[PDB]
Structures are given as C-alpha cells and as structure tokens.
Amino acid sequence: MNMLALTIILPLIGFVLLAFSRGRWSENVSAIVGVGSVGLAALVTAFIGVDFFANGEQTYSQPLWTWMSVGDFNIGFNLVLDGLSLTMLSVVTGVGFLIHMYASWYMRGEEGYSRFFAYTNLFIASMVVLVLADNLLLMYLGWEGVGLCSYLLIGFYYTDPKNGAAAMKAFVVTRVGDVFLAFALFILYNELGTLNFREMVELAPAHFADGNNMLMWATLMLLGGAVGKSAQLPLQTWLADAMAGPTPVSALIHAATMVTAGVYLIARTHGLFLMTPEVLHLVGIVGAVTLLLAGFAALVQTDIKRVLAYSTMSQIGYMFLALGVQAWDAAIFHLMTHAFFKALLFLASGSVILACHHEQNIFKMGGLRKSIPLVYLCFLVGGAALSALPLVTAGFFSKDEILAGAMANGHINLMVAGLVGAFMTSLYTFRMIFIVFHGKEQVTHSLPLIVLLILSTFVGALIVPPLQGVLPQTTELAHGSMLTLEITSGVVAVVGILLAAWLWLGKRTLVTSIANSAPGRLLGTWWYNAWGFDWLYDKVFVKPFLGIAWLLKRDPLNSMMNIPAVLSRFAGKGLLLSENGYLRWYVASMSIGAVVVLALLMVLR
Amino acid sequence: MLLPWLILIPFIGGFLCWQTERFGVKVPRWIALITMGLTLALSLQLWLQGGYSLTQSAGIPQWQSEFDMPWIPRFGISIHLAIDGLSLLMVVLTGLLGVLAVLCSWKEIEKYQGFFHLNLMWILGGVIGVFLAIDMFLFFFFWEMMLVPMYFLIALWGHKASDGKTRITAATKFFIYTQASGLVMLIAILALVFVHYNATGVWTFNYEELLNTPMSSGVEYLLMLGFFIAFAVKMPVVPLHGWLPDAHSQAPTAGSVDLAGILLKTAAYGLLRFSLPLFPNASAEFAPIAMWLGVIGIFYGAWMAFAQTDIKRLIAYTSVSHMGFVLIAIYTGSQLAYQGAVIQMIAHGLSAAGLFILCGQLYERIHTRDMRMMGGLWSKMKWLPALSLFFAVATLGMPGTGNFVGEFMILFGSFQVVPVITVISTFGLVFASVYSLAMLHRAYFGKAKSQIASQELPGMSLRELFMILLLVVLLVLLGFYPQPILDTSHSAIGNIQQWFVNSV
Numbered sequence A: 001m002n003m004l005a006l007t008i009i010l011p012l013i014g015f016v017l018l019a020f021s022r023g024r025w026s027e028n029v030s031a032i033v034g035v036g037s038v039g040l041a042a043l044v045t046a047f048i049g050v051d052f053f054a055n056g057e058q059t060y061s062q063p064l065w066t067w068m069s070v071g072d073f074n075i076g077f078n079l080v081l082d083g084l085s086l087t088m089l090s091v092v093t094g095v096g097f098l099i100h101m102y103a104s105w106y107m108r109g110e111e112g113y114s115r116f117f118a119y120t121n122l123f124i125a126s127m128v129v130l131v132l133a134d135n136l137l138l139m140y141l142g143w144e145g146v147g148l149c150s151y152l153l154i155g156f157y158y159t160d161p162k163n164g165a166a167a168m169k170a171f172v173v174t175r176v177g178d179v180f181l182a183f184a185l186f187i188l189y190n191e192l193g194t195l196n197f198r199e200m201v202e203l204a205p206a207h208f209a210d211g212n213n214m215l216m217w218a219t220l221m222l223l224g225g226a227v228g229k230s231a232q233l234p235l236q237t238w239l240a241d242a243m244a245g246p247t248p249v250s251a252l253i254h255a256a257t258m259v260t261a262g263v264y265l266i267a268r269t270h271g272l273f274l275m276t277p278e279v280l281h282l283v284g285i286v287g288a289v290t291l292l293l294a295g296f297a298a299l300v301q302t303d304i305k306r307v308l309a310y311s312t313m314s315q316i317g318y319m320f321l322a323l324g325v326q327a328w329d330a331a332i333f334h335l336m337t338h339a340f341f342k343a344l345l346f347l348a349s350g351s352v353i354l355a356c357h358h359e360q361n362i363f364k365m366g367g368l369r370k371s372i373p374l375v376y377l378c379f380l381v382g383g384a385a386l387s388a389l390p391l392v393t394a395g396f397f398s399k400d401e402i403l404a405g406a407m408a409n410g411h412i413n414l415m416v417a418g419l420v421g422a423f424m425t426s427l428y429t430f431r432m433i434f435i436v437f438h439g440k441e442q443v444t445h446s447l448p449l450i451v452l453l454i455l456s457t458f459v460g461a462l463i464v465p466p467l468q469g470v471l472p473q474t475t476e477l478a479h480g481s482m483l484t485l486e487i488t489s490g491v492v493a494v495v496g497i498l499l500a501a502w503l504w505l506g507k508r509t510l511v512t513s514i515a516n517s518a519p520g521r522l523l524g525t526w527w528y529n530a531w532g533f534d535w536l537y538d539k540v541f542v543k544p545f546l547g548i549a550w551l552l553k554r555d556p557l558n559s560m561m562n563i564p565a566v567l568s569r570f571a572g573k574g575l576l577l578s579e580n581g582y583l584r585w586y587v588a589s590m591s592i593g594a595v596v597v598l599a600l601l602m603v604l605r
Numbered sequence B: 001m002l003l004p005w006l007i008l009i010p011f012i013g014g015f016l017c018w019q020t021e022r023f024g025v026k027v028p029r030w031i032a033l034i035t036m037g038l039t040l041a042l043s044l045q046l047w048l049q050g051g052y053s054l055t056q057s058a059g060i061p062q063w064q065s066e067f068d069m070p071w072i073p074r075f076g077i078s079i080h081l082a083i084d085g086l087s088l089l090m091v092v093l094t095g096l097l098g099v100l101a102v103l104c105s106w107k108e109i110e111k112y113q114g115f116f117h118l119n120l121m122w123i124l125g126g127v128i129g130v131f132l133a134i135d136m137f138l139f140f141f142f143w144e145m146m147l148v149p150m151y152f153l154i155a156l157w158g159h160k161a162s163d164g165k166t167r168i169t170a171a172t173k174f175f176i177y178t179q180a181s182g183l184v185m186l187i188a189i190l191a192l193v194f195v196h197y198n199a200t201g202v203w204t205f206n207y208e209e210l211l212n213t214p215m216s217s218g219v220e221y222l223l224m225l226g227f228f229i230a231f232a233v234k235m236p237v238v239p240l241h242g243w244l245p246d247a248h249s250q251a252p253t254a255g256s257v258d259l260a261g262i263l264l265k266t267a268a269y270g271l272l273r274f275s276l277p278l279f280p281n282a283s284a285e286f287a288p289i290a291m292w293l294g295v296i297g298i299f300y301g302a303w304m305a306f307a308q309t310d311i312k313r314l315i316a317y318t319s320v321s322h323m324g325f326v327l328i329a330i331y332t333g334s335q336l337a338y339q340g341a342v343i344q345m346i347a348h349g350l351s352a353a354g355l356f357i358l359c360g361q362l363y364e365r366i367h368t369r370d371m372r373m374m375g376g377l378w379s380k381m382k383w384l385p386a387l388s389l390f391f392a393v394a395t396l397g398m399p400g401t402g403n404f405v406g407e408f409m410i411l412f413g414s415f416q417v418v419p420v421i422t423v424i425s426t427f428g429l430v431f432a433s434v435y436s437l438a439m440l441h442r443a444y445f446g447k448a449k450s451q452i453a454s455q456e457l458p459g460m461s462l463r464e465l466f467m468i469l470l471l472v473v474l475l476v477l478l479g480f481y482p483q484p485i486l487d488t489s490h491s492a493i494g495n496i497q498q499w500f501v502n503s504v
C-alpha cells in the first residue's frame, strides 16, 4: 500500500526514457520499456488492492511534499486511496496495460514507436495523478496532463494536417472545460479556504448555512469541467474529430483515461453536489440529453470509429444520468464495464482497419465474418455488451443498475430517456455490425483481446467496485419493480437488435427509402453533423476569433502610438520651410518677432 | 557589501572583454563567461548566506544586505544599494540569463566581439543595478544607462538578414520609448523629492525617507502616473508595447540581447518596490484602470501572437500577454497574487529564454523565420522540435512547469479580490493555449511548405543542448517544487502587501 507513488513514478520513468531514447532503440526494447512500465504499474496496483482489502478497505493517505504554501493557501502533493480511487486506478492500469500490449503489436513498423509509447506512458501517469489526488489542484495537474497527452496522441500522425487540427480542437475545447474547472477551484478556495476533498466536504455545510449561491456556482463550474473532459453537452464536439488518431489512442481515451475523468470528478465531489440538488439534477439532465443526441448521431454515421465515438458519448451520458439520480455505485459500475467493452470494441475496430486495407466506409465492406472471424466474435460480444444484451453481458447489469437507481429516486423522465437511449443503442450498434460484417465480400494482441472478451461478458459484472463507505448507497427498488424494470430493459434491447436485423441484414429497401426521403435526408444530414453543434461553435467562436485576428494583425495600437512620430515629422517639415535661405525674409521674421514680443508685453502689462 | 561587486563585476568584466581581444578573437567569450559565472556565484552565495526562508515580515524598510556611499551630496544622492528576497531572486535570474546569453553567443568569432561582450556585460550590470538601487536617482540612472548598449547591440550586431535601416529604426523606436518614459519617471521623482523637501527641509533621494511623504490626493496620483508610465513602457503594457516585437525581431540572431535586457522584468519589480509603497492610495484608486489594461494586454497580446507569421514576434506578443497577467496581480493587494506574480516573472523569464534560444538555433539551421516556409520539422531535426514543444507547453501554463504555478496563484488571489477580471483572464489562458498550439503546428507539424524544410538539418551541439536542458530542468523543478522560491520572496512580498493595504 506504501507503493502508491510507484503507479505514477513507473509510467513517468517510462515516458522519460522513451522520450530521451528518441527512436534510437529497437522496437522490442521500446515495447519492453513502455509496456513494462504500464504492466509494473498494474502489478503494483494489484498489490495495492490486495493490501487495501487486507486492512478492511480503510482509506490510505500518502503525502509526499507540500506543493504550495502561501499563508492560508496550502496545497499538498498528497495521494489518497479509497474504494473509488482503487476502482479508477485498477481500471486505468489494467485496461491501459492491455491496450499497451495491443499497441505493442499494432504499432509495429510505424514511425515514432518510442514516441507513441512515451506519450501513452505520460497519459497513464497523468490519469493516475488525476484519480489519486487528495485535493483539487493536484487533480487539476492530472487533468491538464491528461488533456495534453490526449492532444499529443490524437495528432500523432503529424504529417497529415487534419490530425493536427483535430488534436488542436480537442485541446482547445477541453481547455475551455479546464477554465470552468479553474473557476470551481477559485470559488471553493475563496469560500472554504481549502481544496482537499474531505476538508471541503466537512467545512461546506457550516460555511454555507446562510447562503448557498457560491456553492451552486462552484458545483456548476465543476460540472462544466466534467462535461469538458467527458465530452458531454455542451463541450462534446471534440470526440468525433479525436477519432483522427491511432486506434489504441482511441481505446485509451474512450475506455481507460480521458472520458471517465468527468465522471470521476462528479463522483469524488459528490458531497458538494448533494448540498446543491438542482445542480445534481442538471448533471442527470445533461447526461440524458447527451446520451439521446449521441445515440441519434451514432445512428447515421458511415464510419466505425465515428459510431464508436458517439457510442462512448452515449455511455458517458448514461454515467452522468446515474450520477444525477444519485446512483453513484451504478455510475462507477458502468464506468468499469464500459471501459472493458469499449476497449474491446476499439481494439477490434483497429484490427478490422488493419485487416481490410486502410480506413473505409462501412458500406464499402460487407460479409466480413468469414474472412476475419475472431475479431467478428470480439465485435459481436462488444456490441452485445454495448447494447446491454440481458443475462450474458456486464453492460446489461450496469445499465439495469443505472435505470433502477433512476426509478427508485422518482426520476421517471430520466429513466424513460435511458430506456429510449438503450433502444437506440441496440439500433445503431447492430446496424454497424450487420452492415460491416454481414453481406457480400468486396500472441501479443490475441491475449488482450481474449481478456477483454471475457471481461465483456457477465464475468465483468462479477467484479464489484468496493464503494462501501465512499459513496452513499442508492435506494433499493421493490423486488417486483426492479423485476419488471429488468424485463423491460431486456425486451427493449432484444427488440432493438431484432429491428436492426430486420432493417439492415437483408436488402435495405425501407432503410434506403427513409434515407432518400426528403425529411429523412434532412434528419440524416442534421444528425450526421451531430445536431449542428460544430457548425454553431465554428460560427460563434472560431470565425470571430479569426476575424479579429485578421483585423488586428497590423497592430492598430502600435500605429496609434506611432501617430506622434508622424506629427513630429510633419511639423518639422513645415518648420523647415521658414529656412528658405533668404536674408530679407530673415530680417522680416526678426521684425515680425519684434512686433509679436512688443504686442505680448503690452497685452500682459 | 557584496552588492557593489554584484554591479561592478559585469562592468569590469565587459572592460576586460574589450581589452583582451588583442590576445585573441576567441578570448572575450571566456572572459564574459567567467564574469557572468562569478556574478551568478556571488548571487547564489548571497542566497545561501541571506537566510531568506526564516526571515519574517518586519515592515518596509527591511533589507538583508545594504550598502551606502555618497555620490552627489548636494542633492542628497547616494550610491545606495539594498537586497531583500524579491531583488535577490531577480538578481539570481539576471545572472543565470547572463550566463545563458554568453553561452548562446559562443560561436560569434567576429572581429569586434569584444565590444559585443562589453555591451552585454554593461546591460547585465545595469539590470542588476536596477534591481539593487534604493536611491531614486541611482535607480533611474541604471534604468536609463542599460538602454545605450541595448541600442548599439540591436543597431550594429542585430539581425543580419534585415537591412541596416530596419535595425536602426527598431533600435531608435525602443530607445525613444524607454528613455522618454524614463524622463517622465524622472519628473515624478523630482517632484516627489521637492514635495518632501518642502515638507521637511532636507535633500534626499533615498527611497526609505521618501516613503513617509505627506501629499495631497492629485499630486500623488500624478507622481504615480509618471512612475506607471515608465513601468508600463518597459513592462510592456498596451498601448505602450509596440517597441517590443520590433526590438525582438531585430535583435542579434542568437538571442543574447533577448535574454540580457528584455526578459528581465524590471518594470514589475519597479511597480512592486516603488509604485505601490511610495503611492499606496494613488495605486489603490488606479487599480481598476491597471487591471483592465492588463486584461486588454492579455487578449491583445494573444491575438497578436496568433496573427504573427514570424516566430520571434509571436514570442514577443506572448510576453505581452503574460505581463498582462502580472500587471493584474500587482494591483490586487493580495499576498497570494503577489507570490504568484513573482513565480510568473521567474517562470516567464525561463520559458521565454528557452523559446528565444530555440528560435535562434532554428534560424541558424533553416535561415528563415517565416512559419509559412517551414512545416514538418519534427522529422528533420533531432532535438529542437521536442524542446520547442516543451517550452510551448510551458507558455500555455501547463502544470508541471512554473508558469502554471505563477498564473494560477495570481488568479487565486485575484479572484479573492476581483472576480470578473479573474474569469476574463482565465479565458485569456484559453487564448494562450490557442497561440502556442498554432505556433507548434505552423513550425514543426504538417508537411514541408518550402525547400529548406524538406531536408535533414544538423542537430544541436552539446552546449546548446546543455543550456536548453538546464532551462527545462529549472522550469520543471519550479513547477513541481516552487516552495524555496516562495520562501525566498515571502518576507519582501509580505512587507510590500502590508504597506499597500495598511495605508489605504
């Protein structure tokens, strides 16, 4: 348990070694250093979990040094480990290790192998810092490190400028989220005098007994930071473009590290949200709206990576819905299970891309179960877990827990939105699966695929996160109520899969009739561009920024301050006309000056 | 007692740099290196012997070291030097940047580099004298003396690619800006001295005696305005900033002029040391104007940096934005914001030094500074694009670098004082990330946009790599462990803050 800092130090050492190697080492040595750093972090995490369960799930605090100390402003470089922290650390280290082995197989023969593994090691270290921090500023260090590593890894193929544009857009949108998070940090320090999570929770109800306005502002800004990192409303526009990077980058961003940071932030600061119930309801509403919009967007995508990105947005919306209905255990459970099956789906999609030429439209391929069957099976159980196939997948149990928590607290509208989103999830998932894999044809990586294959089944649901004593328990439904809830969710998922089979497996006559219809074409164009949010942000933020830059590029203030120089030049040129060289004019000017001096003396006498 | 030698070792070293050129043309660089290393060693020895961490705030004046000598006794003018924690940090940074400026001009083996090194050492000695002088005439004297070798270095040793007329114009614009603003400050100093003489009857330019000067509101505002005009020109504060990208663009290509007397924040130190304690009420009334000027500086400098096609002008406008943050911090009256301003000054010096040195090396490799003629330079160079990526990550305020510590403590204290200005400034941090990523993508990523960027380039040598990696290590250590720096400046910053808020 005293090796808690090793989970940061080993990925940091891996990043430093692989960065300063600069591609000089061989592929095997670079793979050994990177994958072994993440694997040693995972092994230390396993030992930490065994020690954590040895002393009865007691919270362990390991301070290292004091980061900042200016009077009452005291920020510590301290790590903490509770059940939520252990769950996030285990998910991050284990899933990142599996993705690292798959990337060691996958990135063979590519330029920047060691640079890729240095960046992923820094990503792992940043996320471990994020989830292990005991105060908000150290968690902000992990937050920005995760955002920077995401920017470095999305634009990994730097020669294509559109990869760099996608990475820049992801960094800028997430930095807007980080600015909202910074606002939350400023408000919380100004009110409570501390940024330690436990200390803020203790000191909040005494300080905010008179007024609660600043606490509502702080929780609203915390939600803004969370939706920045988790790609929710209204900062969700970067994920589908962040698909520009390599496949293990997408697996790391969507399963292990990046999009789960907002869910972890809301769950960690759950007490402050519990004292602001309207903001928590807003968290749930944002999750519901985001999952509905993401499902509708994923319904009409023509790319596997875009479908998986909007599916990730929908599942993070499910976790935000669980947080907003005060089903915290369900949110973390769905976080872990979604990490499993989304990592499996993204690695399977990368194997598909490697096997079938370059990246392609989904309608170009077809009948791919015969050629590449093991990755078809991986896609099958990944989509079954994504669509919450009952009694055989962990995603079914996670979504059932979320919906039961929504129903038990009286959030009927959020539960209805979750059921509709589950129907659409089955629809888009098996639409993509049946289009890509059905139709007419036109050991370093097998082991992570097998492990994520097993963890996407009910074996993943057998793992229970130890959130006793960290998060409050959700209210239990009546046995009949959760029974019919389970039957309704399973029936909705099975009906959605059957409708996807009826719509896309055979000759898509009704689907093509709907798509070519004018309202259908309009709705498909609207949902394909993710409801026009990218267009709105380009018109509202990007275009006036570029316009003001073009208007200011000549430095108008510099010219305004250069005005006295041109005035001096003009006045000197005008005064030099008096020096015409004529003696009679010099005499006349002397007499003019005599007249002026005499008149001035007589006026002011 | 060592403070006169802290000023005099650069001057004697520059004289020896000029004098030793007859012994060989590779000699004056060694003399300059030993001179700046001796100055840095004396500064570090003063840091060790000062005991700044255990020093408590006793009120202005409180000096860890002091030196006095009569200079012009008719006006009560003395060579009066004094060091405390803030000035000690500034002097240590000056010595380190002077060593880097000597090391960066190591390969210039021309026929008149003795005069080059003499001008560099005279600039560094003038900067140290600015940081040490607590006599107002002596402070003004150093403030104006360090601009003549600046003018001559830009005008004669500047950017060789540009025409001579462009270098003359940039040097003249810089000199006119700085010296006219200094003369306005001299008018304010003289009027303050005359007010004190009318109140008491003695001739003094001593800053300790001029602190207790009773004056009406309106006189104090005008004296504050003269001081602020000088500091705002040299900070820079918009719209008195236009000299800075021109001076940076026509500075010598290695960038020793950039490090030696531009990236040392004498104006923020002057605002903290002189403007706030001498005129606390006038600064309190001026605070909203100065904060909004800082906000405008942040966003204007960010937009100007984005619009640049030259890297040097881009980095100069980044300096404008970060100094806008420091200017916001100075007028808060918050101890946390002041400590953040100190950290931001040091970290910006380090990060901008790294950026300017890397830009000079890139210009040596590719012989152009237009970003439209490069691209994809990550695949062509060995060390430079990765270190440039690290330094661009530093100037956007990434945690793990000292820039984040600086501006985030600034924003914490400022939100404790002024919330609206703080939230607008954090959106300024978003703008900073925008311009840093834009420069990185224009220079090193993408494909080659010309012929010079499409070929393999020679790697960095051991000396350039050593100084860049030293800056990297210092920035990372400042980001992760800023506590010794905060403990060094804690007493002086506390004295200034207590004087500012106890007299308002």
Ligand SMILES: CCCCCCCCCCCCCCCCCC(=O)OC[C@H](COP(=O)(O)OCCN)OC(=O)CCCCCCCCCCCCCCCCC
Binding pocket: A008, A012, A016, A018, A019, A020, A021, A022, A023, A112, A114, A115, A118, A125, A126, A129, A141, A142, A144, A145, A146, A148, B378, B381, B382, B383, B386, B387, B389, B390, B393, B398, B399, B400, B401, B472, B473, B476, B477
């Ligand atoms: C606390 C846990 C983490 C928490 C979150 C932290 C987030 C903020 C971290 C800030 C540090 C900077 C992050 C970004 C650095 C990017 C550098 C980079 O791209 O390095 C890769 C590059 C090798 O790439 P490659 O393409 O193979 O080679 C180039 C040409 N052949 O590499 C190279 O070419 C060589 C190396 C270049 C510089 C590498 C980074 C320097 C800064 C970090 C190490 C500093 C030194 C260590 C000691 C510090 C003091 C104790």
Ligand SMILES: CCCCCCCCCCCCCCCCCC(=O)OC[C@H](COP(=O)(O)OCCN)OC(=O)CCCCCCCCCCCCCCCCC
Binding pocket: A164, A165, A166, A168, A169, A172, A173, A176, A234, A235, A537, A538, A541, A542, A545, A546, B427, B430, B434, B438, B441, B442
């Ligand atoms: C209801 C609203 C809720 C909140 C919504 C927040 C939306 C945040 C902004 C989303 C859009 C960000 C898009 C960033 C794209 C970056 C990638 C890109 O397109 O790069 C192109 C360009 C590169 O620059 P360059 O190299 O010069 O050009 C080469 C040629 N292309 O680079 C550029 O063109 C750079 C353009 C930068 C634009 C930055 C705009 C920042 C605006 C922040 C506003 C925050 C508002 C907070 C809420 C306020 C409420 C009143």
Ligand SMILES: CCCCCCCCCCCCCCCCCC(=O)OC[C@H](COP(=O)(O)OCCN)OC(=O)CCCCCCCCCCCCCCCCC
Binding pocket: A561, A562, A564, A565, A566, A568, A569, B169, B172, B173, B176, B177, B178, B180, B181, B184, B229, B233, B240
């Ligand atoms: C905050 C505002 C109030 C306080 C201000 C304090 C003063 C310091 C800060 C402001 C200084 C502004 C200086 C503006 C001019 C800068 C110098 C310059 O541009 O020099 C270059 C120029 C020659 O270059 P070029 O354009 O090529 O001309 C060739 C012509 N055949 O050179 C020339 O053309 C000749 C230039 C002669 C000198 C310039 C005029 C000086 C006038 C007095 C300045 C004092 C402030 C006056 C009020 C300013 C506005 C409020």
Ligand SMILES: CCCCCCCCCCCCCCCCCC(=O)OC[C@H](COP(=O)(O)OCCN)OC(=O)CCCCCCCCCCCCCCCCC
Binding pocket: B184, B187, B188, B191, B195, B198, B214, B215, B216, B219, B222, B223, B225, B226, B229
């Ligand atoms: C072009 C660039 C340079 C700018 C132009 C040159 C400077 C112009 C300064 C204008 C000053 C106007 C003063 C108007 C009132 C004068 C009469 C008066 O009321 O005198 C009162 C007082 C003398 O009586 P006393 O017994 O001393 O009263 C105690 C009060 N302290 O009087 C005193 O104690 C003396 C008061 C002196 C006030 C300060 C004067 C200089 C201030 C710094 C420079 C101006 C501000 C910055 C530049 C502006 C933009 C360019």
Ligand SMILES: CCCCCCCCCCCCCCCCCC(=O)OC[C@H](COP(=O)(O)OCCN)OC(=O)CCCCCCCCCCCCCCCCC
Binding pocket: A564, A567, A568, B216, B217, B218, B219, B221, B222, B225, B229, B232, B293
């Ligand atoms: C070749 C052409 C181009 C070159 C040349 C251009 C022009 C150069 C000259 C420019 C300066 C003009 C004079 C400015 C100072 C005027 C001073 C003044 O009017 O003072 C009146 C009064 C004096 O104070 P009094 O009332 O006597 O105090 C005792 C009562 N308690 O004062 C007061 O009561 C207080 C007044 C406070 C404000 C006075 C100064 C205003 C300055 C405006 C610009 C700066 C604005 C702030 C900074 C912005 C950012 C730099």
Ligand SMILES: CCCCCCCCCCCCCCCCCCCC
Binding pocket: B089, B092, B093, B346, B474, B475, B477, B478, B481, B482, B483, B484, B485
């Ligand atoms: C003026 C230039 C400043 C550069 C940044 C310096 C930042 C401070 C670095 C101090 C050393 C940090 C690592 C060693 C810590 C030793 C702790 C001793 C007590 C336990």
